């Protein structure tokens, strides 16, 4: 069903990611230079606050500035509704692409197929530019989003594009702010692949757990310290299924980066994303030998202190003929 | 407030706590403890307490209610408006408005 009041569609798990990307890009979508994806809780309850508004308005502005794609849940619940509202607001004041994936099974007031109009057991936002529903079946609304969104992100990550330096590749950064366990599972699977994640060290209950982490008894104590009601409700047997995951979160500190709550800088969003992305290139070792791509990447991302301290530093024979092209740029 | 919280007689009740904390001017406590997170108050929970806050001239509480998930359109759409206008009006304000309009 296609609805306009943006494009809509029904998604099947078996559908190949390459075919979906080809559809998107060829038909309605331009080449992607960045894929900022926000992962949070789909629960209606959210910790709305002025700080939460400020920590996301800058993100939206950066996404527009670089032309990045924004992937979200997109079911008109808390953070997702705010994201849709901010996308609309930016459109009012040269377009933003916001794909929102949800589960078909949960969908209520189903209107099967041709431009049917729906007016109104899952509610869906109508502000997203593109909205996708995926459920091969099981109308009981089981978790199905993870089976397709992660595969799409990984495929786009491997898709090489000769632009924005970064070894002719695409960033594919994950941004975590919600307190849901689904967010924890998404973080685990993303860490499984070569995708750096940045977590907010603020109101997020589970995000605060991960922030404090950076000794299973300490893990249990930290988990108890946050969301005590959920900790008590969960059975003891299932607790293991979480503890191991936390270890995987703390398995590698190279990728995981977090923001400082105390910092009140206006450009903290850009700086954090830039640093987290930069670490992945530095540690990848694919282009670590290459000493010119690093500077070209660091230039586009406004970072003077990092460029001065790391790129040039000392004991490097760049010579006067090394800066020609980068200085021109 | 601590005595009510620990009494357990109305600890299960989650609305009396906020009503108590409103009359006693405490914005930080109300924001941190009452709402906090992981509570499904919904948009229909703040109706009466927000009405009382409007009556009692609690601006900070009004802002906290509005920004924290409250929907003003639905609340205003109710007949409460009529009530809020039929009784709430100060008598001297009404008389002065009438004389000013006539003059």
């Amino acid at each position: 069903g296609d609805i306009q009041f943006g494009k809509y569609l029904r998604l099947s798990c078996d559908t190949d990611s390459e075919t979906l990307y080809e559809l998107l890009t060829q038909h309605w979508h331009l080449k992607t230079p960045n894929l900022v994806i926000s992962v949070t809780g789909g629960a209606k309850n959210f910790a709305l606050k002025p700080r939460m508004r400020k920590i996301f308005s800058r993100l939206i502005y950066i996404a527009q500035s670089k032309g990045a794609w924004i992937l979200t849940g997109g079911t008109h619940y808390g953070l997702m509704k705010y994201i849709g509202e901010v996308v609309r607001d930016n459109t009012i004041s040269e377009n933003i692409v916001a794909i929102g994936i949800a589960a078909w099974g949960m969908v209520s007031n189903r209107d099967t197929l041709f431009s049917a109009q729906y007016i109104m057991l899952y509610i869906l936002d109508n502000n997203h530019t593109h909205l996708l529903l995926v459920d091969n079946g099981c109308h009981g609304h089981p978790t199905v989003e993870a089976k397709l969104r992660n595969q799409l992100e990984k495929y786009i990550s491997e898709r090489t594009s000769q632009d924005s330096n970064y070894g002719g590749k695409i960033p594919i950064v994950c941004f975590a702010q919600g307190g849901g366990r689904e967010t924890l599972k998404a973080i685990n699977t993303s860490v499984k692949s070569k995708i750096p994640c940045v977590v907010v060290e603020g109101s997020g209950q589970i995000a605060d757990v991960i922030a404090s982490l950076v000794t299973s008894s300490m893990v249990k104590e930290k988990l108890v310290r946050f969301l005590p009601r959920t900790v008590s409700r969960l059975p003891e047997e299932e607790i293991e299924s979480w503890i191991k995951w936390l270890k995987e979160i703390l398995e590698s500190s190279h990728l995981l980066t977090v923001i400082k709550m105390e910092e009140a800088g206006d450009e903290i969003v850009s700086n954090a994303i830039s640093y987290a992305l930069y670490k992945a290139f530095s540690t990848n070792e694919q282009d670590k030998d290459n000493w010119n791509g690093q500077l070209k990447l660091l230039l586009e991302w406004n970072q003077l202190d990092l460029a001065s301290d790391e790129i040039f530093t000392n004991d490097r024979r760049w010579e006067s003929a090394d800066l020609q092209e980068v200085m021109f740029t | 407030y601590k005595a009510f919280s620990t009494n357990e007689q109305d600890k299960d009740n989650w609305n009396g706590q906020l009503k108590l904390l409103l009359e006693w001017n405490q914005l930080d406590l109300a924001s941190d403890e009452i709402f906090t997170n992981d509570r499904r108050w919904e948009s229909a929970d703040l109706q009466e307490v927000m009405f009382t806050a409007l009556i009692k001239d609690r601006p900070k509480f009004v802002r906290l209610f509005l920004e924290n998930g409250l929907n003003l359109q639905k609340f205003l759409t109710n007949e409460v408006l009529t009530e809020l206008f039929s009784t709430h009006f100060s008598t001297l304000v009404y008389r002065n408005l009438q004389i000013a309009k006539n003059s």
Partner: protein, 34 residues
Amino acid sequence: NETLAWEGVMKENYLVKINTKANDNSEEMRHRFR
């Protein structure tokens, strides 16, 4: 309709400007010290 929405957006910016002017006291060093 559209003009009113644009007005609301400009209002958002105006209120943010007021908040920034209020916060420009640069007194956060006190709480940082604490």
